[PDB]
Design a protein around this ligand. Structure first.
Ligand SMILES: O=c1ccn([C@@H]2O[C@H](COP(=O)(O)OP(=O)(O)O[C@H]3O[C@H](CO)[C@@H](O)[C@H](O)[C@H]3O)[C@@H](O)[C@H]2O)c(=O)[nH]1
Ligand SMILES: O=c1ccn([C@@H]2O[C@H](COP(=O)(O)OP(=O)(O)O[C@H]3O[C@H](CO)[C@@H](O)[C@H](O)[C@H]3O)[C@@H](O)[C@H]2O)c(=O)[nH]1
Ligand SMILES: [Mn+2]
Ligand SMILES: [Mn+2]
Lengths: 258, 258
């Protein structure tokens, strides 16, 4: 399956660290698919070079450029910068099917079985469960769908200020149609749901395949003691500690060659 | 449909106020079904008499009595008092299909369409969306199912300390099977999801058919100014104010005849 991939996104260096750890986690669990990352010119050349190693393909998108198809739409709704860049994940017509994953996710086990799913497949979002979380989703690249999402972004925008309301408005049958398009929550496990909902977590939380660090606080916003191999501080740091083990073990030395 | 009903529960007087408002909301939106409430001896005679007016049937359950089928199980796991009482909702074999509703819910529109659903149908729980919320669900009374839930309550208990983990463990195919058994979130809208998730709410929150007051703070734990017709105090009190309008308008005067 050379025409299938995991696709992530990073518009800066902080998020590139996430992209790097995520990509490493993917390789660590032996994925048979291609690894792709959408990037912007604002990503440093040192970060960019590390991504060229972790990823099979590094694509460069620049919506600030008048030559991009999303530029006009960025002028009309300038707050949607990250969202419009994200939508270019549907432009990767070199792939037949992809699994989009936020740069703040971490893969804990092989998830190649997601490629059995069809567009649009995604896990429920905690908070408002009739909306799917846009941090992890299965889609099929297409110029027609992309132009269609751009159009909707222009005329309506997003009810959340981010891509989530836009993707839910466009793929509106998700809640009431096809249970198969409802990815098990363990494929996009919100870290907030882990420390908060202790019961539900203690019961199914060990089955987690993908952790999603949703809060204000990303993993790279923590301090990690290298001796003790643990973050400094609240009830379940084991997930932050794995992110840092990967970053410290495989990402940091990789960045030292620059 | 004389053999179909909405079934609620109350083990004391505080929750009976909820049961009373809920039952009134049901009548207010003209339900064609029967109204039933499970009660305990601990419910005052004044509360009991008000329930006999709002409800078509008031059933009395006493698990503290050695003569109840759940008593033995209550001795083995005494923390499950409210849960084991709740499970008697499956003993109401006088009805072919029922919609169980927590005493802390409020019906904002006719929801007779829920009787088209089969057991077990329920809305996703915010927090851990692969588990359904047990505050609103469609089921079919049965002695066999009841004995089966009792058995599971005895051997395993509940992973949440309440009925939710027990019902999810028993009806375990909910997450991955039949999108029809996934009731739209508007049929069991968590009030926490209303004030917290402002975006998602502002977009679909006006479609709400049932509000569920999940917090530590129930509606009866608020102070309601009768002149201004509003609770004293955080972003969306309109739902608390409707609960109090119903309580003040239809429940309080009804209780004065005692
Ligand atoms: O400066 C930025 C910000 C974001 N991103 C990318 O965009 C993704 C989305 O943003 P993130 O910072 O990870 O946001 P979340 O905490 O995951 O949340 C947002 O995105 C979730 C799913 O994507 C939604 O559930 C939330 O409502 C929304 O607030 C990130 O993972 C990155 O891949 C960048 O590249 N650069
Ligand atoms: O002393 C009591 C306590 C509860 N109840 C009844 O039991 C229902 C459940 O309890 P409630 O106080 O309403 O709890 P919730 O805030 O709604 O939450 C609990 O129940 C939810 C769904 O029932 C789950 O999502 C939560 O995890 C669980 O903590 C109530 O509505 C009542 O009908 C009584 O009759 N007497
Ligand atoms: Mn994210
Ligand atoms: Mn409740």
């Amino acid at each position: 399956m050379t025409d299938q991939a995991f696709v992530t996104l990073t518009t800066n260096d902080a998020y590139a660290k996430g992209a790097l750890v995520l990509g490493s986690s993917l390789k660590q669990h032996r994925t048979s698919r291609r690894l792709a990352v959408l990037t912007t010119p604002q990503v440093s050349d040192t970060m960019r070079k590390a991504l060229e190693i972790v990823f099979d393909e590094v694509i460069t998108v620049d919506i600030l450029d008048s030559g991009d198809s999303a530029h006009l739409t960025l002028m009309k709704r300038p707050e949607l910068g990250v969202t419009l860049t994200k939508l270019h994940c549907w432009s990767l017509t070199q792939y037949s099917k992809c699994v989009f994953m936020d740069a703040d996710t971490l893969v804990l086990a092989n998830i190649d079985d997601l490629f059995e799913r069809e567009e649009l497949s995604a896990a429920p979002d905690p908070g408002w469960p009739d909306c799917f979380n846009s941090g992890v989703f299965v889609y099929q690249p297409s110029v027609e769908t992309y132009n269609q999402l751009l159009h909707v972004a222009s005329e309506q925008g997003s009810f959340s200020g981010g891509d989530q309301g836009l993707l839910n408005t466009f793929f509106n049958s998700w809640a009431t149609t096809d249970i198969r398009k409802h990815l098990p929550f363990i494929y996009n496990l919100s870290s907030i749901s882990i420390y908060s909902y202790l019961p539900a977590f203690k019961a199914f939380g060990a089955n987690a395949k993908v952790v999603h660090f949703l809060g204000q606080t990303k993993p790279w916003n923590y301090t990690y003691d290298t001796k003790t191999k643990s973050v400094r501080s609240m009830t379940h740091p084991q997930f932050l500690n794995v992110w840092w083990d990967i970053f410290t073990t495989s990402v940091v030395p990789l960045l030292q060659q620059f």
